[PDB]
Amino acid sequence: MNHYEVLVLGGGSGGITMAARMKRKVGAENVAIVEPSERHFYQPIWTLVGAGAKQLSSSGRPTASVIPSGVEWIKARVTELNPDKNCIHTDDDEKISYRYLIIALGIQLDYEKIKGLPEGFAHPKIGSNYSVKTVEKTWKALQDFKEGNAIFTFPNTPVKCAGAPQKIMYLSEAYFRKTGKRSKANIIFNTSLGAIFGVKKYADALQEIIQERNLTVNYKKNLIEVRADKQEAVFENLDKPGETQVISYEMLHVTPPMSPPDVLKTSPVADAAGWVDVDKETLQHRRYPNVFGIGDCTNLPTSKTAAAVAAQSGILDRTISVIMKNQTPTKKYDGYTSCPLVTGYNRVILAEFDYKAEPLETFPFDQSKERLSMYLMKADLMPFLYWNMMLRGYWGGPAFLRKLFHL
Amino acid sequence: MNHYEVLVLGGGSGGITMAARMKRKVGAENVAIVEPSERHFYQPIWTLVGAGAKQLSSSGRPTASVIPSGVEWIKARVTELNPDKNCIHTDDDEKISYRYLIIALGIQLDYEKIKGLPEGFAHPKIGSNYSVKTVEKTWKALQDFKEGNAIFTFPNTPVKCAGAPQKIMYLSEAYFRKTGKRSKANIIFNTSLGAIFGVKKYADALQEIIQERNLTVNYKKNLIEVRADKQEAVFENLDKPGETQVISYEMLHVTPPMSPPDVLKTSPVADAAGWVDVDKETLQHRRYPNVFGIGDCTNLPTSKTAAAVAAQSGILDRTISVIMKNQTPTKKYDGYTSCPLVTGYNRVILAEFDYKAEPLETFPFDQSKERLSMYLMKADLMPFLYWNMMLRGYWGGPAFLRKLFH
Ligand SMILES: Cc1cc2nc3c(=O)[nH]c(=O)nc-3n(C[C@H](O)[C@H](O)[C@H](O)COP(=O)(O)OP(=O)(O)OC[C@H]3O[C@@H](n4cnc5c(N)ncnc54)[C@H](O)[C@@H]3O)c2cc1C
Ligand SMILES: Cc1cc2nc3c(=O)[nH]c(=O)nc-3n(C[C@H](O)[C@H](O)[C@H](O)COP(=O)(O)OP(=O)(O)OC[C@H]3O[C@@H](n4cnc5c(N)ncnc54)[C@H](O)[C@@H]3O)c2cc1C
Ligand SMILES: COC1=C(OC)C(=O)C(CC=C(C)C)=C(C)C1=O
Ligand SMILES: COC1=C(OC)C(=O)C(CC=C(C)C)=C(C)C1=O
Ligand SMILES: COC1=C(OC)C(=O)C(CC=C(C)C)=C(C)C1=O
Ligand SMILES: [S]
Numbered sequence: 001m002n003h004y005e006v007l008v009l010g011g012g013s014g015g016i017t018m019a020a021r022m023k024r025k026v027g028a029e030n031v032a033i034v035e036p037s038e039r040h041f042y043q044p045i046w047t048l049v050g051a052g053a054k055q056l057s058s059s060g061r062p063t064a065s066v067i068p069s070g071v072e073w074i075k076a077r078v079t080e081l082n083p084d085k086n087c088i089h090t091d092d093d094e095k096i097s098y099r100y101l102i103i104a105l106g107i108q109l110d111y112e113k114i115k116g117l118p119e120g121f122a123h124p125k126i127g128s129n130y131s132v133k134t135v136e137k138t139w140k141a142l143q144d145f146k147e148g149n150a151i152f153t154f155p156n157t158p159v160k161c162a163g164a165p166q167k168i169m170y171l172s173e174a175y176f177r178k179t180g181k182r183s184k185a186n187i188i189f190n191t192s193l194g195a196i197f198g199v200k201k202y203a204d205a206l207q208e209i210i211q212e213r214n215l216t217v218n219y220k221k222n223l224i225e226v227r228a229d230k231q232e233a234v235f236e237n238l239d240k241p242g243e244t245q246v247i248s249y250e251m252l253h254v255t256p257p258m259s260p261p262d263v264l265k266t267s268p269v270a271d272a273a274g275w276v277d278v279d280k281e282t283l284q285h286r287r288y289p290n291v292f293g294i295g296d297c298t299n300l301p302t303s304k305t306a307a308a309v310a311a312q313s314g315i316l317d318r319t320i321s322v323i324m325k326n327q328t329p330t331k332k333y334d335g336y337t338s339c340p341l342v343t344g345y346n347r348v349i350l351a352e353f354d355y356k357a358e359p360l361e362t363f364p365f366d367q368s369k370e371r372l373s374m375y376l377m378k379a380d381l382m383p384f385l386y387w388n389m390m391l392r393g394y395w396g397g398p399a400f401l402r403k404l405f406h407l
Numbered sequence: 408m409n410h411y412e413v414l415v416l417g418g419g420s421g422g423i424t425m426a427a428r429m430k431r432k433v434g435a436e437n438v439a440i441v442e443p444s445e446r447h448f449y450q451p452i453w454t455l456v457g458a459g460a461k462q463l464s465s466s467g468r469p470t471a472s473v474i475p476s477g478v479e480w481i482k483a484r485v486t487e488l489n490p491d492k493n494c495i496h497t498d499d500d501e502k503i504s505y506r507y508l509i510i511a512l513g514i515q516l517d518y519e520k521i522k523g524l525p526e527g528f529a530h531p532k533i534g535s536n537y538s539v540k541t542v543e544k545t546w547k548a549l550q551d552f553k554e555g556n557a558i559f560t561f562p563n564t565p566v567k568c569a570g571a572p573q574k575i576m577y578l579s580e581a582y583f584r585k586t587g588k589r590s591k592a593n594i595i596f597n598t599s600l601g602a603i604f605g606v607k608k609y610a611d612a613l614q615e616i617i618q619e620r621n622l623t624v625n626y627k628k629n630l631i632e633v634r635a636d637k638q639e640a641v642f643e644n645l646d647k648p649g650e651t652q653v654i655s656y657e658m659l660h661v662t663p664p665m666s667p668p669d670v671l672k673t674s675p676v677a678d679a680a681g682w683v684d685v686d687k688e689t690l691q692h693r694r695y696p697n698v699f700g701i702g703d704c705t706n707l708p709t710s711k712t713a714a715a716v717a718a719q720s721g722i723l724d725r726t727i728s729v730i731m732k733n734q735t736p737t738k739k740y741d742g743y744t745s746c747p748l749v750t751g752y753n754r755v756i757l758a759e760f761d762y763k764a765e766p767l768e769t770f771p772f773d774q775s776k777e778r779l780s781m782y783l784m785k786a787d788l789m790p791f792l793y794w795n796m797m798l799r800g801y802w803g804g805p806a807f808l809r810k811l812f813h
């Protein structure tokens with residue numbers, strides 16, 4: 001069997017980041033990354049790509065160029081995990097064994113669970129900022145919008161970046177005002193959830209925007225079918241099972257249902273729901289002490305964001321070092337995550353909170369306000385920090401900055 | 408390869424029931440059931456077996472004994488579903504094709520997601536009414552109870568028969584009074600949920616029982632580990648991530664986390680959560696119009712019960728007949744389900760409700776009262792009606808009875 005001291009499953013945000021940090025602990029020759037994609041994407045900027053403010057090409061780089069230098073890139077898909085025997089299977093009919101395993105497989109998009117998708121994306125007026133293949137379609141639907149309903153959805157599953165399905169709604173609204181067709185737009189957000197946002201401070205600031213900008217939100221309403229050729233969409237009322245509703249659209253932004261990666265769903269390392277079952281504070285796996293998890297694929301009960309990955313990578317780095325010398329981990333992840341809620345082409349409400357879903361803000365000012373500074377940070381500084389600091393293993397979240405300020 | 412007009416996946420409550428109904432529609436020779444288990448169990452009576460009021464031997468019959476005559480029993484496990492090619496795969500490497508598919512694969516028990524199970528069951532004082540292998544350990548733990556915490560758990564997943572985890576707690580409480588050792592038992596229900604029951608009328612009834620009979624209920628508390636050799640159970644506080652609590656027990660009753668069967672989790676027929684993705688009124692699959700689902704494996708947003716299965720079976724029978732006649736289905740399932748809440752060795756609160764979580768009571772009296780009549784119905788009549796009417800395709804729930812009593 002091919003064998004690595006440290007095996008990292010997934011070469012996305014958590015996976016590259018954890019590889020860089022482990023390369024410094026055990027040497028690069030002893031780290032490997034299993035990743036099928038030829039290309040590594042900074043997904044947060046896709047919100048702005050779909051609103052025409054950023055280029056798609058700049059959001060990605062060849063996976064080879066972000067593999068930490070000297071680390072083995074195994075270009076393949078994980079097809080099975082066998083933790084009892086400290087190995088995994090790949091779709092190249094190889095098995096790979098490990099001393100330590102870091103699982104960073106992200107979340108899976110399930111567009112096909114919506115009847116009429118993904119074939120419906122072939123038609124005009126419909127897009128999705130969650131896929132490299134549909135994010136520019138969001139922008140063409142917005143550009144081409146003439147008059148009628150502009151509908152944005154939120155599915156009945158866990159998602160990554162829970163703020164993004166409404167970020168694109170606020171940008172669309174601002175685009176209609178800037179181009180003079182706001183009066184011809186009936187803007188609707190049909191969300192499976194019960195509330196605009198999970199934290200009251202930001203929910204409240206967001207509700208104010210909902211009222212001032214004449215947006216409609218229907219709660220407990222899930223998209224179940226798209227008829228793209230007829231520009232109609234079908235939603236179920238999650239509160240009155242069996243009741244559906246058909247509604248035409250001049251533009252539709254689909255946030256797809258999401259789920260754990262298929263290979264984890266039935267794996268021994270998953271919990272009952274298919275997420276990687278790790279300790280909530282140390283990210284060490286609950287039942288296999290040499291397995292760890294980070295990011296979207298875990299069952300960490302906080303928002304699934306890259307800011308969370310950043311904050312988790314700093315904890316996991318310590319956890320693994322403590323475990324490597326048969327000691328009890330002591331530093332504890334707090335559930336830190338962040339949500340740069342783009343409310344316009346020049347504003348962001350920067351939500352930050354922890355496991356108790358209470359504000360944990362970095363800056364000494366009220367981040368519940370729409371801010372130019374926070375927009376520039378998301379649009380311009382965060383991509384640079386990601387490529388040049390987070391992926392090199394030098395970004396574990398802004399806790400030190402927060403304590404630096406409050407001083 | 409082998410092909411059947413109607414292929415039924417699963418030979419449990421809905422599988423056998425649907426195969427019987429379909430035999431009458433397409434003929435026995437055109438129906439097949441894929442089912443691996445040699446034994447078919449009437450699971451509801453395990454609540455009473457765990458309490459030592461019924462025998463485990465009587466809850467099961469050979470699978471061969473309930474297969475409708477003429478209907479092919481394919482003794483195997485489904486390992487793959489390919490609805491785009493109208494076929495499924497089994498674990499003896501056979502491709503089976505169908506004209507229509509009924510999926511009745513049930514719900515999967517995931518004991519091993521509780522750290523320390525299922526190896527913990529080898530130790531005394533721990534049991535589980537949800538498994539043929541542990542229901543009798545419940546009753547052993549109940550009799551052997553001397554003094555301490557009697558702990559009953561409810562997981563953080565969907566479940567079948569959501570009432571059964573408290574049913575055995577009430578039975579245990581009555582047993583302790585009847586054997587003089589009630590003063591020696593601290594009885595605790597540690598549930599992942601935030602409410603005792605989702606229908607307020609029956610939740611208020613159970614709330615009075617809890618208060619009158621000195622039971623503790625701790626909400627948002629989820630069992631995560633058993634240390635059966637030390638008789639300790641670990642709970643997480645769902646309201647404060649990171650917080651846990653280690654409790655000693657003298658008796659522990661585990662309700663295991665549950666999930667869609669593994670073969671369905673990654674299947675095209677599943678919704679994103681892994682449940683069979685069916686129309687909530689017709690039970691026809693949303694995306695594969697020759698696929699249907701019934702029972703615990705579906706995403707029907709009501710309680711996962713045998714009574715729901717029976718009411719579903721009448722609807723699905725009509726849905727499939729109408730489709731075969733090139734008509735559009737019209738008769739609608741209302742979410743009917745029933746929970747015969749055993750509150751003691753002589754009493755049942757018969758909860759009956761629909762999709763809107765509103766009571767939908769068959770009998771003209773108040774079923775939120777503890778009733779002897781309802782206990783005898785659960786303990787003696789329902790098993791009889793199950794084996795001899797429901798599994799033969801002649802029980803579609805009690806809606807006709809309801810209308811007659813009203
Ligand atoms: C539109 C959008 C906007 C967002 N905005 C923000 C934002 O403003 N702020 C923020 O903090 N976060 C944001 N996010 C979320 C952020 O992108 C993710 O949370 C982050 O990428 C999670 O990192 P990860 O490593 O867990 O998953 P990913 O970065 O997605 O990486 C997972 C990797 O695993 C690989 N993989 C999958 N299956 C297998 C397999 N079987 N074998 C091998 N490899 C496999 C995939 O190819 C992928 O490379 C946004 C996301 C989207 C979609
Ligand atoms: C302790 C207990 C008490 C209960 N009490 C009540 C009660 O009072 N009232 C009530 O209404 N309900 C009650 N129920 C619930 C009731 O038993 C179920 O809701 C009912 O059995 C659902 O039937 P089903 O066909 O959906 O699943 P099941 O009856 O479980 O049948 C599913 C079948 O699929 C088979 N199978 C699984 N995987 C595969 C595969 N890969 N390939 C092929 N076959 C497969 C299994 O072997 C099984 O035979 C109780 C359940 C329990 C556990
Ligand atoms: C349909 O979406 C809407 C809401 O949902 C969040 C509102 O609260 C409101 C505000 C209503 C009050 C009484 C503040 C409006 C006007 C609205 O359109
Ligand atoms: C790109 O993804 C993100 C991070 O990871 C690099 C962050 O650390 C943070 C937090 C950083 C600060 C300065 C609050 C945010 C908001 C974010 O969006
Ligand atoms: C065996 O499980 C059960 C059924 O399936 C046969 C029922 O139909 C019903 C409903 C039947 C009546 C007479 C209300 C109940 C309560 C039940 O527990
Ligand atoms: S986000």
Ligand SMILES: [S]
Pocket residue numbers: 161162163164303305338339340
């Ligand atoms: S977010």
Ligand SMILES: [S]
Pocket residue numbers: 567568569570571712745746747
């Ligand atoms: S039940």
Ligand SMILES: [S]
Pocket residue numbers: 568569570571710712745746747
């Ligand atoms: S129930």
